[PDB]
Amino acid sequence: THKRRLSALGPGGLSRERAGLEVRDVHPSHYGRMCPIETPEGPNIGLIG
DNA sequence: CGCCCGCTTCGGGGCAACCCTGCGTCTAATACAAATCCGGCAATGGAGTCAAGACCAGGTTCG
Numbered sequence: 001t002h003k004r005r006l007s008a009l010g011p012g013g014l015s016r017e018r019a020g021l022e023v024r025d026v027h028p029s030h031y032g033r034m035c036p037i038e039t040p041e042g043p044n045i046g047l048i049g
Numbered sequence: 050c051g052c053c054c055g056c057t058t059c060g061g062g063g064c065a066a067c068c069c070t071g072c073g074t075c076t077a078a079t080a081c082a083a084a085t086c087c088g089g090c091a092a093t094g095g096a097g098t099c100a101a102g103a104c105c106a107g108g109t110t111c112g
Contacts, residue, residue, distance in 0.1 A: 011069085
């Protein structure tokens with residue numbers, strides 16, 4: 001699970017303080033491409049899948 | 050009846066305060082003088098050391 005892990009942070013990506021609230025939610029296109037369950041539950045919810 | 054002219058009202062601009070869309074190897078020496086380290090004898094002179102050796106004073110033993 002450390003492999004096959006999809007993030008949105010890092011270089012070339014948005015910062016944590018600049019993270020919009022809408023990019024943390026589950027779009028309905030995620031069905032089959034990203035898990036809507038497994039994610040860190042700190043101040044990183046939805047930024048890492 | 051129309052007209053100027055500053056007074057107020059909003060716009061736009063301008064500016065001040067915080068993050069990363071941020072985050073290269075380079076002529077090459079010589080010549081000389083001054084300062085400084087340092088290595089090694091070369092005077093020590095005072096401070097420690099051994100040993101003899103004397104100094105009685107009061108237990109201790111002997112008469």
